[PDB]
Amino acid sequence: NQFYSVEVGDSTFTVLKRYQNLKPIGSGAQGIVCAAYDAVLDRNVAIKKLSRPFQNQTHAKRAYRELVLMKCVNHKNIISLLNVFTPQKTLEEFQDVYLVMELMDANLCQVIQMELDHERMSYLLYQMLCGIKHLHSAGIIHRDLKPSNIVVKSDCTLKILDFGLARTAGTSFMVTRYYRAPEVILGMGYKENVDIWSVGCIMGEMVRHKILFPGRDYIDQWNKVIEQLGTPCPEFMKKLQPTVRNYVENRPKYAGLTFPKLFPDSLFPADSEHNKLKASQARDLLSKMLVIDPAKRISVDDALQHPYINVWYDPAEVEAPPPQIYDKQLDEREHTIEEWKELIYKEVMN
Ligand SMILES: Nc1ncnc2c1ncn2[C@@H]1O[C@H](COP(=O)(O)OP(=O)(O)CP(=O)(O)O)[C@@H](O)[C@H]1O
Ligand SMILES: CCCCCCCCCCCC[N+](C)(C)CCCS(=O)(=O)O
Ligand SMILES: [Mg+2]
Ligand code: NA
Ligand code: NA
DSSP assignment string, 30-72: SEEEEEEEETTTTEEEEEEEESSTTSSHHHHHHHHHHHHHHHH
Residues near 61 by Cβ (< 8 Å), separated by ≥ 6?
166, 334, 335, 340
CA distance 163 to 141: 8
Provide the residue type at 228 as one letter. Q
Which are the contacts of 203, defined by CB distance < 8 A and separation ≥ 6? Answer: 121, 125, 282, 285, 286, 289
Which residue has the least CA distance to atom 12 on ligand 2?
Answer: 187
Residue 254 DSSP symbol: -
* Pocket test residue of 142, 218, 227, 244 for ligand 2, highest count of atoms within 8 A of CB: 244
CA atoms of 340 and 101, how far apart (whole Å): 23
DSSP category for residue 138: T
User: How determined?
Assistant: X-ray
Report DSSP state, residue 217.
Answer: S
Task: Determine contact, residues 118/278, Cβ cutoff 8 Å.
Answer: yes
Cα(347)–Cα(141) distance, integer angstroms: 23
Residue from 34, 107, 142 whose mutation best tests the ligand 1 pocket (most atoms within 8 A of CB): 107
How far is C-alpha 207 from the geometric centre of its chain's CA atoms? 19
227: CA distance to ligand 5 center in Å? Answer: 8
| Ligand 2 pocket residue status of 193, Cβ below 6 Å | no
- Report strand pairing: 43-50 vs 31-38: antiparallel
Ligand 1: distance of its center to the CA of 59 in Å?
16
Of ligand 2's atoms, which has the minimum distance to the CA of residue 221? 1
CA 142 to each of CA 10, 129, 222, 269, 309: distance values in angstroms, whole numbers, following the listed order: 31, 12, 21, 32, 21
The rounded distance, in Å, linking the Cα atoms of 223 and 251 is 8
* Bridge partner residues of 161 (DSSP): none
Most distant CA pair in the chain, distance: 68
Which residues are known to be catalytic?
144
Ligand 1 atom nearest the C-alpha of 102 is 1
- The Cα–Cα gap between 10 and 8 comes to 5
- Measured distance CA(315)–CA(320) in Å, rounded: 8
Q: What is the DSSP letter of 144?
A: -
Nearest CA to 110 among 146, 147, 149, 156?
147
- Residue from 169, 190, 145 nearest 57 by CA: 169
CA distance 283 to 95: 49
List, as residue ranges, the binding site for ATP. Answer: 25-33, 48
Question: What whole-number distance in Å separates Cα of residue 102 and Cα of residue 181?
Answer: 30
Tell me if 108 sits within 8 A of 293, measured CB to CB. no
Ligand 1 mutation pick, 161, 162, 175, 202, max ligand atoms within 8 A of CB: 161
Ligand 2 atom with the shortest distance to the CA of 222: 1
Q: Is residue 279 within 8 Å of 272, Cβ to Cβ? A: no
Q: Give the integer Cα–Cα distance in Å for 232 and 238.
A: 10
Assign a CATH topology to domain 106-320.
Transferase(Phosphotransferase); domain 1 (1.10.510)
Ligand nearest to the CA of 163: 3
Rounded (5°) CA angle 63-60-342: 100
CATH 1.10.510.10 residue ranges of the chain are 106-320
End-to-end CA distance of the chain: 21
Stated resolution in angstroms: 1.8
> What is the 26 CA–ligand 1 centroid distance (Å)?
6
Q: How far apart are CA 53 and CA 283, in angstroms?
A: 42
Nearest CA to ligand 2 atom 3: 186
User: In whole angstroms, what is the distance from residue 196 CA to residue 306 CA?
Assistant: 13
Q: How far is the CA of 34 from the centre of ligand 3 (A)?
A: 14
Neighbours of 21 (CB within 10 A): 12
Looking at CATH, the fold of the domain delimited by 3-105 is given as Phosphorylase Kinase; domain 1 (3.30.200)
Residue 26 exposure: Cα atoms within 13 Å on the Cβ side: 19
Distance 144 CA to ligand 3 centre (A): 9
CA distance 58 to 224: 31
Within 6 A (CB) of ligand 1 lie 25-31, 33, 46, 48, 79, 101-104, 107, 148-149, 151, 161-162
Compute the Cα dihedral for 242, 243, 245, 246 and give only its sign: positive
Q: Which ligand is nearest to the CA of 148?
A: 1
Residue 186 alpha carbon to ligand 2 centre in Å: 5
Closest-CA residue, ligand 1 atom 13, reads: 26
